[PDB]
Amino acid sequence: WEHRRFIVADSRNFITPEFPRDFWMSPVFNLPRETAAEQVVVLQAQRTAAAAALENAAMQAAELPVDIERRLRPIERNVH
């Protein structure tokens, strides 16, 4: 056995909250069609894309000091 009090769950049990006068004039409920939060996500992704493109370009352009040596040395030994 066991004992407790009880409250009937009737459909008439309602609740009455209080709203502030300036509650609904919030900058969050009222959102424009385009916000800057998304622009942050796009711009960060573009910056990160440019970061990896920089390394790709660096590994591409690292051959510039290399390509010049082997085009001049076999002609230098040819003249000498």
Binding site: A50, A53, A57, Q60, L64, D67, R71, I75
Partner: peptide
């Protein structure tokens, strides 16, 4: 030797232009 320098003139200009195009592409990512 007159033609070997011409080949270096042409072959070394169509390669660094790729570097310039890649740099412009990287800027175009931004």
């Amino acid at each position: 030797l007159q033609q070997q320098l011409q080949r270096t003139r042409r072959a070394l200009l169509h390669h660094s232009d790729a570097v310039l195009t890649s740099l412009h592409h990287v800027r175009m990512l931004l």
